[PDB]
Every structure is written in C-alpha cells, then in structure tokens.
Amino acid sequence: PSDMPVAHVVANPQAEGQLQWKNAGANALLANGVELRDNQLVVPSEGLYLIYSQVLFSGQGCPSTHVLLTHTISRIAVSYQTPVNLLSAIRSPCQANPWYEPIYLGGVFQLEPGDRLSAEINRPDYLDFASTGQVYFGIIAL
Amino acid sequence: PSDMPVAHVVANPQAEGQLQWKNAGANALLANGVELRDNQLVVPSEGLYLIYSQVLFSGQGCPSTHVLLTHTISRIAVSYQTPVNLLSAIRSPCQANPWYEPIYLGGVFQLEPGDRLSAEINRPDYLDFASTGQVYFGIIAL
Amino acid sequence: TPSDMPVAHVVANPQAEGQLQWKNAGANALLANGVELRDNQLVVPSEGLYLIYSQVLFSGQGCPSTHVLLTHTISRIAVSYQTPVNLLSAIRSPCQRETPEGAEANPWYEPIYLGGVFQLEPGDRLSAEINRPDYLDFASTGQVYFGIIAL
C-alpha cells in the first residue's frame, strides 16, 4: 500500500571523511522505484516531490581565521550532466571545546524521471555521523 | 479536517523545567486517530509519515561550563526495545551575550499502529518561549 | 504542474539591499492550483492541511555588537481573524564577540529553516518575514524561499 516513490537514506559511519549515503540502519528507506546510484538518488517518476536533507557539522577548534561550511541539494537531469542547485545553505562556524552546526535543507520541487539528486557538502572532514539520526537525505513523491 | 492522521503540538509555556507538548489553541492539530499520550505522539495506522520538530534554546550569557544542547525524535515501537533515533542534532552555545540556537529535524518514516514518537531535548532549562511558534512537534500520514 | 494540489514555491527578489520581497520567478518557482501571490503574501484558495516552509539566509561583515539578532517568521492572516498570528518562528545570533576596531572584518552566514503542517481556510494569507532585511544575503536560487502544498 505505501507505494509512493520514497527514500530516506543516512550517512555511513565506517566511511571515513566522506559523505556517502546508504540504505542501511533500522529506519532507512529506498522504495517504490527510487534508486541510490553513484551516491545519488534517482527519481523514478514525474511529479511533485518533497525533498530534504540534514548534515551535522562538528569540530574541536577553529583552526583557520575563517571557514565556510555549505550544504547543497542539486539536480542532474538525465541527458544533462551538469548539476543545478535546488536548495543551498551556508554557515560560518567562527569569527578548545567542540562546536556543532546542523544544517537543514527542505523544499517541494517538480522532478522528472531519471533525475539524480545529490546532497553534497564542502567540508566532509568536519562531518559528524557519530550517531543515528544526525546525517540524512530523503525524498517523497507528493 | 481531512482523512489522514495528523498532529502539530507545541510546548506548554507553563511547564517548569520540562518540555511539555500540548494540543492548545488553534493552529495546532491532533486529529484522525493520532493521540498525545505521556508527552508522545501515538500513531494509529501503518504508513509513511513526515515527522518534524523544532526547538529554540537561548541564554543571557554563556554558561560557566560548556553545555551541549540536543534535540531528538525517537521511534518507540515496544516497551522492551530501546527507542531508535529517527532525527537528531546537537548544538553548542559556547566556544554578557544573548544567544539563540534553533534545532530543526524533519524526515519521512514508515511507521506502524501504536508506534510512539517522542521529541526530546537533553536540557529543559534553556528552552525559549518568548514568542508563539518557536517550539513545535508534528506529523502527517502521507 | 503534475498534481492538482494547491502549491507554491516563491523566491527572494534581489533588486536593492532593502526588502525581502517574494516573486514567482526563477528556475525553481511555482504558483499553481489557485494559490496567489498578493501584497507580498501567499493566498490560499481552499480548505486543507498545508505543509508550510521557508528558508532565509542572513549574511553580514563582522560584528558591530554581541546582540545582533536575526528572526524569521511565518504568520497566518486568517479570514476568521485578520491579524498576523505566528505559526513558525525562530531566532539566530551570529555574533559571539564584537569584531575589534581595525581588525580584518569577517563574513558571517546564518540560515533559518521553518517547516510545519497547518489547517488553512480559503482566503487565508501567509507571510514570511524578517527583522533585519539589511542582513538578508540574497540572491542565488535555492537560498531564500517560501513554499506551501496541500496534502
């Protein structure tokens, strides 16, 4: 019955210094057409999708005078190997006790069959996949 | 309202040192079979749910001691199994300055009838209620 | 526009530093199925459960003080009662220290994401508003948006 194309994938903990999504964990979804290919979610159908993502950024101190953390959801159309941002957010973590920066991305978008979605970051060397629930990427057809 | 199991509860400002969810004053829902019991959302039927919650912490200055501020949503399927973190994020107020730190969690989960969803912070003494819509917890069957 | 459901996804219009003005334009924009954009608000055409959401991005150059505050607020202007009532609100604070005088000024950035579900009446008006539009980052698509969908 729960037959709408859907995905809720999480970061792999054993994958050191990389944001690589997996259909693993007690509560992860890759269902009703959606695929995880080349670290990307493949859209099986045309329609309105709710898409979202969260990354937890962590670090011990502030090494450089200034560092910028970004979180992006981009779209690649089937014959168009050139990604295009749908959601994007930026945080400056600083202007030695640890810091934390969760970044939530969320929106409703018109998607086409075969579109690839990536949830990317610039600083995987600051990712914190240290616990369940902290790093996720999901989509649902509406 | 409609046909689908739906909830949008908010923190009770009269609740001393406890995050207390209530269905109170309109612009809040709790309908189509969803119950609020023992501070937790109880789901009535199998299905894919969008699940989301927000908390806002704040302080007048930075605590003499380093504090981690967390927020998490957990699936409680049965008394004998340990709750599973669906959505979790950490914040740290400090590396007399007023500070505000929102945590937003939101994801799509397959659930079963009777599942209990809890939305819980580690530290209640840093919750902010100074405005109306800063602390909320909700779900909708999709 | 594949589904018949009321749907919006409007973005910020950058034209002069000033205001957070919503516009139905860009490669990601949507205004369908009765939903209207009027007096800088989303107008709802029917009764139903709507997922409402927005993201704003603030940016500044260094910290004039320690009490710069950044607010974002989705409000409901109901046909039943016509005054802005908060549905979703959050506050951020970019500045832990003042940037000392003559010190290289550093760029800061703070996102706020608001998202939640609400029963809306036909003719209800929704706004997504900030306190410091002088701190709004703009410009690029995918950073500052406001959206709704009938579930």
Swiss-Prot record, chains A, B:
It is found in: Secreted. Disulfide bonds join C62-C94. Changing V84 to A/D: Biologically inactive. Coiled coil: none annotated. Residues 1-142 are extracellular. It comes from the Eukaryota. Residues 5-142 form the THD domain. Changing A77V: Biologically inactive. This is Tumor necrosis factor, soluble form. It comes from Homo sapiens (Human). The lineage of its organism: Eukaryota, Metazoa, Chordata, Craniata, Vertebrata. The gene is TNF.
From Swiss-Prot, chain C:
The chain holds residues 83 to 233 of 233 of the full protein. The gene is TNF. It is found in: Secreted. The lineage of its organism: Eukaryota, Metazoa, Chordata, Craniata, Vertebrata. It comes from Homo sapiens. This is Tumor necrosis factor, soluble form. It comes from the Eukaryota. Disulfide bonds join C63-C95. Residues 1-151 are extracellular. Residues 6-151 form the THD domain. Coiled coil: none annotated.
